[PDB]
Design a protein around this nucleic acid. Sequence first.
RNA 1: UUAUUGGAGGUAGAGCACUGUUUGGACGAGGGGCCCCUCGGGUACCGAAUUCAGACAAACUCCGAAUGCCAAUUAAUU
RNA 2: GACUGGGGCGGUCGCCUCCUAAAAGGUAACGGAGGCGCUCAAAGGUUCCCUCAGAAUGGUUGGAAAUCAUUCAUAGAGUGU
RNA 3: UCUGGUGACUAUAGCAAGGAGGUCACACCUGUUCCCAUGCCGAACACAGAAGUUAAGGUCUUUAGCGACGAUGGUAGCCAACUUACGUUCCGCUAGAGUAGAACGUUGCCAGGC
Lengths: 141, 83, 94, 82, 166, 119
Amino acid sequence: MLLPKRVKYRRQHRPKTTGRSKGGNYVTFGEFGLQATTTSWITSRQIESARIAMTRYMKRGGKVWIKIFPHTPYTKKPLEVRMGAGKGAVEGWIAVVKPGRILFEVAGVSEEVAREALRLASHKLPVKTKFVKREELGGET
Amino acid sequence: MKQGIHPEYHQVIFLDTTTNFKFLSGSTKTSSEMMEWEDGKEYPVIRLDISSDSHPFYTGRQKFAAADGRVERFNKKFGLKSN
Amino acid sequence: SLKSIIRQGKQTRSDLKQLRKSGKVPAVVYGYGTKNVSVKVDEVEFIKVIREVGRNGVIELGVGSKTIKVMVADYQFDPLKNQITHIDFLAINM
Amino acid sequence: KKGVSSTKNGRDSESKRLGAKRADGQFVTGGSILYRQRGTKIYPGENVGRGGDDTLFAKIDGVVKFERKGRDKKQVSVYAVA
Amino acid sequence: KEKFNTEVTENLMKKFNYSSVMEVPKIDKIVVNMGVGDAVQNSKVLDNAVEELELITGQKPLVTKAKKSIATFRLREGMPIGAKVTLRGERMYEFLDKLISVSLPRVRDFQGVSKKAFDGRGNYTLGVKEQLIFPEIDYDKVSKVRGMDIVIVTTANTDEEARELL
Amino acid sequence: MISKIDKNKVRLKRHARVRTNLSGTAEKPRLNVYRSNKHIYAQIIDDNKGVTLAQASSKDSDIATTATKVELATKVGEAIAKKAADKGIKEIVFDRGGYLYHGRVKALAEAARESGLEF
RNA sequence: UUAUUGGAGGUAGAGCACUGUUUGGACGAGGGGCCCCUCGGGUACCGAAUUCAGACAAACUCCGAAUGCCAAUUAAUU
RNA sequence: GACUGGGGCGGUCGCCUCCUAAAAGGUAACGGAGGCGCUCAAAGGUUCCCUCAGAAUGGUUGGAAAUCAUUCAUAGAGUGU
RNA sequence: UCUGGUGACUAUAGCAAGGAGGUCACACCUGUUCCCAUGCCGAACACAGAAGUUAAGGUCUUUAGCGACGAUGGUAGCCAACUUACGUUCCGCUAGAGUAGAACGUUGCCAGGC
Ligand SMILES: [Mg+2]
């Protein structure tokens, strides 16, 4: 529907990626963060909505980041066509999420309000989730 | 030094102070400070104005020219008027 | 400073996932004292030992002969499972 | 629907069959090619001559041997059949 | 001339506690230069004037950077020179150039490393050869060099060869 | 700041550039030329042997040169030929280091042909 | 076919050193107005300057596996 | 006239480089990006010589764009196309 | 193995910084009559000299700040096989990168002086 998050293309058509597996990508900025866990990938529209939520329920300002950005398009072509001919026009952008990325992170608040806003996010995304504290990476050198 | 792209010069009398040589050099006739500088690769004799001692610039600060009578004068004038 | 240990055989085929499942843990220690060692260790008493001395404190790792003082370097944590793998020690200088 | 309306990019049969054509430890005859390439993806050494498309061959019989020179760029060098 | 060089040769060792004559600066290049945003005929007179001041031809490089917005590309340009060993040391004496309003002797430091120069202007005269037969007057850039690591030994150099500082 | 760098290095570039054309060490021995300000050296050498077969140094044996002269170069250029008679080898290639073939180097070579060693 | 040695390339993977994308900081090189001054102050956004950390790629790679492929005056089986 | 995700209209029909191409090669699609249907009497050959873009600062032509000027600059330039 | 010329070696050689020395090496260096030469210029190249000097170049000593090397361990991936349709899992080969440790202020050949 809406695609605010965008960039210079460099190219407008691309073979997809479809996810298999990974871990990692701990928290580095804030304290509290959301961990995606499971089967899907994403468009930007979704992320925007989640940001609306996470900005409202936190008054007192309260800081947010998005560690990821969609670097990839999502093509989908005219309605009720026969297959065959050249790959279709643009409709979307994509930020793939294996199990282990950390989409949303916050700090400036307590442990609770974070957790609420993150519930109110994970209902508004495909992926199952998990709540995390920044206490440890798996490497510090 | 190529031969066909190189000009030359002439003109005229050497000096009085050193031996009576001209060493492919100048002869510089000035008025305020009157050094007959035999120091110039190209044309003498040169009816010039400065020796670099004339103006208070190359040598340095000097008395050379007032530049003074004006200010002071007008000042005293206006002063005595109201006085 | 007190850790009960088994000594590892260094060819412990990918079924060592059993060890990690048992709460046991692999690790190594090196630096100034000796050349290289592979060990086992419990996770439980290790997370005790973190708070006990601190991150970079001086543990006396277990052998059976002389314990070696160490200043724990590194570990490779994994999310989605909430635990540690392959701790890294360091036999310090004096 | 069908036809409408596009490129047709695609110029898809474009082949020249490059690569390598001998191997180490291989007796070889004079005039024989070892290795096609472009630029100098491999340099020549001894007993070798190059051509007007950066091909490589052996001016003389022997045994093929590739080598390293400067941590990036290799070279090929026949050495004498005993 | 070099007669002064024998004096400053002493002054700059009095002043800076070196341990060697060899650590002293020494007479090095001049470079003249000119230029135009565009020219068609004047180049003949560029060479004319510069060849009249200096006793040898200046040369005509090109603008080689792709410009298509100030003029076309590779319009003729320039008259640089390398003036040297003794034509050089004679040239530094030729400095007599007050024309009318040279009351600004330009203390301010030409390149921050050891090159301090009296970059200047005009063709009326250079304190030498008043011509007064012109199409036009043109700025005549300069550089000047002493192998050193600081502008202050240099300012001491051209000052001890009696430059006006401020 | 500015510095006329040592001329050995640009010489070195000019030395290895010609060898890339080829050296000839494995055809017949190569003769080289170093050029100090005060005097001149020379050697012949071949590979893979790595064996230096000739040397002819003016100041290193016959001291007190004193002036770098073209003629003195000719002496040394003969002397390697005599020093090569014992081997008699053969019609050698002549390396130019990174130097011009103008003389005095050209004089060394010219008076090296004077002896019985050809190019 | 297997074992043993050697060998060409640059996928998976990993990564930011080029290409290009990107987030938040540090930011200073400096500006734009609204306004003061009236010579300067410039008070949100910024380019690039330089960098801390974290990311992305069939048509980016400082790197780089398993497999396969090419030969062996080599050996066993067939 | 053939292809042709029925056929038709549309589009293409030969050649060069890449990617898809699965670490040799080869390997299709109405898959994704670009071109070619020439030019040179020197831009060829050969012997010599040299090393650039960018950046910093001072200076007439002041987008710090024009040439200068050194320093830093491992190829970021240029390579008929 | 003190110096120097020329070769080989994956930059473990380097790069940055500082300390020391020269008339035996080399260099700066004085100069341009000749050789010759600079698109302007003896700056460069070249020829003739050796007035001055260790400043620079270059050589030696030391530094691990930069860059290159860099294991061992365990991880991702994957060849074979079993289950399974699971953005699969378990088992057996193999074995990265990144990274820590550590390594590193070169090593040898030939001639000629010594
Ligand atoms: Mg990948």
